[PDB]
Ligand binder design. Structure first.
Ligand SMILES: *[C@@H]1O[C@H](CO)[C@@H](O[C@@H]2O[C@H](CO)[C@@H](O[C@@H]3O[C@H](CO)[C@@H](O)[C@H](O[C@@H]4O[C@H](CO)[C@@H](O)[C@H](O)[C@@H]4O)[C@@H]3O)[C@H](O)[C@H]2NC(C)=O)[C@H](O)[C@H]1NC(C)=O
Ligand SMILES: *[C@@H]1O[C@H](CO)[C@@H](O[C@@H]2O[C@H](CO)[C@@H](O)[C@H](O)[C@H]2NC(C)=O)[C@H](O)[C@H]1NC(C)=O
Ligand SMILES: *[C@@H]1O[C@H](CO)[C@@H](O)[C@H](O)[C@H]1NC(C)=O
Length: 407
């Protein structure tokens, strides 16, 4: 529950780590964003400069915190480090989860229903096994993560298909193939899943009479018909250092806003992407002022889908993915120490139009399946701009991306 005190909810898991109440929530937002930034940069490195990039970093943190609940030692420590939970001012590693839940409460349970922002988590564990009873309870109590019994052992590729359809249902059709083909096997014990959906209407619309098809040129040497939108109004805006523009497009309500970032034409995104931090982002935010301006942005849809393994390994999640060293003895009943994350996937969808925006994303951590290779199917394109959908009052980057192809 959201309306509760720190001691009230007995959320003491197995392990623990070292290292008014509203300020906890806020410290976790700083943590989350630091992860978000860093995760973004590593992920950027993996991709081309001209490739699209979209994701919910909030989603990832959530799914990995869910996982954290049955972690121990060199798995629990790394989890806190990598996801900057070891930054929040509190001495115990089980205190993260009370605040994450409260953050989640603020995010997904508001009276202000200008824009729709929902989330659904769920554990899908093998049917034959028994899961630690405290584990289970906290999972559902803190995150809302019910445990659904699927037949990993026998009917494997249909349970892969049932988790995907579950995500699909919770993301209004947008997120369809979270779990890639052939990743859930006969040994798959548990699959931890997050889901976030957003849909907002602009605070000020783009009339559809003013949209114009104009052609877009890629770095390879190709053309596509972009659909530019147009509008004129007062918008929080700033031309910052190096001739970079930061424009903010608030949604009906003012609580959630889309924040664009475009570099001076000559320059690339790289410089800005390489120096991108939470501090940097808030600087610009504080700088912005109300301005009469003409906005031209595309009518477009981007979808991004990837594994988090290599990237997260790079930032320090090494034990968790390791078959020999991974430490997760709070999940099942006996302490099965053959629990290790095979692979973890993410998939996001962005759609911006005249009427507003729709964003969806999902994260699925898979315990003991296979670890497949990055399945890449995307093309490079020119002149990219960063997008960020954020919740103002609670300092959280919900979605975050780099649009690079508006067709
Ligand atoms: C994801 O799965 C959800 C269930 O867990 C499911 O949501 C439920 O869907 C039904 C839709 O049939 C919702 O019920 C609606 O309730 C109102 C009651 O006021 C009805 O008016 C409405 O029926 C429509 O109304 C007409 C009758 O005047 C009829 O002619 C129309 O054709 C139509 O049937 C529904 O009965 C229910 O509230 C939903 N929520 C829950 C929690 O159950 C989702 O559809 C599914 N989403 C996706 C994307 O798959
Ligand atoms: C489920 O996990 C809990 C902790 O995550 C385990 O219980 C703890 O066990 C130690 C002693 O063995 C006690 O000091 C703690 O107070 C226990 N917690 C509770 C709530 O009992 C528990 O052993 C696990 N259960 C199973 C079946 O494995
Ligand atoms: C891991 O942590 C538990 C308690 O936190 C401790 O008992 C154990 O010795 C640690 N090390 C290993 C290798 O398990």
């Amino acid at each position: 529950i959201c309306t509760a005190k720190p001691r009230d909810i007995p959320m003491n898991p197995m392990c623990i780590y070292r290292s008014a109440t509203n300020r906890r929530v806020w410290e976790l937002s700083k943590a989350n964003s630091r992860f978000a930034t860093t995760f973004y940069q590593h992920l950027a490195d993996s991709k081309n400069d001209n490739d699209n990039i979209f994701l919910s970093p909030l989603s990832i943190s959530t799914a990995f915190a869910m996982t954290k609940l049955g972690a121990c030692n060199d798995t629990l420590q790394q989890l806190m480090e990598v996801f900057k939970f070891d930054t929040i001012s509190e001495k115990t590693s089980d205190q993260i989860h009370f605040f994450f839940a409260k953050l989640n409460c603020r995010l997904y349970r508001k009276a202000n229903k200008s824009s729709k922002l929902v989330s659904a988590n769920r554990l899908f564990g093998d049917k034959s096994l028994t899961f630690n009873e405290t584990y289970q309870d906290i999972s559902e109590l803190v995150y809302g993560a019910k445990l659904q019994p699927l037949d990993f052992k026998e009917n494997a590729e249909q349970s892969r298909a049932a988790i995907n359809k579950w995500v699909s249902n919770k993301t209004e059709g947008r997120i369809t193939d979270v779990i890639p083909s052939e990743a859930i096997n006969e040994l798959t014990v548990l699959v931890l899943v997050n889901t976030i959906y957003f849909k907002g209407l602009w605070k000020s619309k783009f009339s559809p009479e003013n949209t114009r098809k104009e052609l877009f040129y890629k770095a390879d040497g190709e053309s596509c018909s972009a659909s530019m939108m147009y509008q004129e109004g007062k918008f929080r805006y700033r031309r910052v250092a190096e001739g970079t523009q930061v424009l903010e497009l608030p949604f009906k309500g003012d609580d959630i806003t889309m924040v664009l970032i475009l570099p001076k034409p000559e320059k690339s995104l790289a410089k800005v992407e390489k120096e991108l931090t939470p501090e940097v982002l808030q600087e610009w935010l504080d700088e912005l002022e109300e301005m009469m301006l003409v906005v031209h942005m595309p009518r477009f849809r981007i979808e991004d889908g990837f594994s988090l393994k290599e990237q997260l390994q790079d930032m320090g999640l090494v034990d968790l993915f390791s078959p020999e060293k991974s430490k997760l003895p709070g999940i099942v009943a006996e302490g099965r120490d053959d629990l290790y994350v095979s692979d973890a996937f993410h998939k996001a969808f962005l759609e911006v139009n005249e009427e507003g925006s729709e964003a969806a994303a999902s994260t699925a951590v898979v315990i003991a399946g296979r670890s497949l290779n990055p399945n890449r199917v995307t093309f490079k394109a020119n002149r990219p701009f960063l997008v960020f959908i954020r919740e103002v009052p609670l300092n959280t980057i919900i979605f975050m991306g780099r649009v690079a192809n508006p067709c």
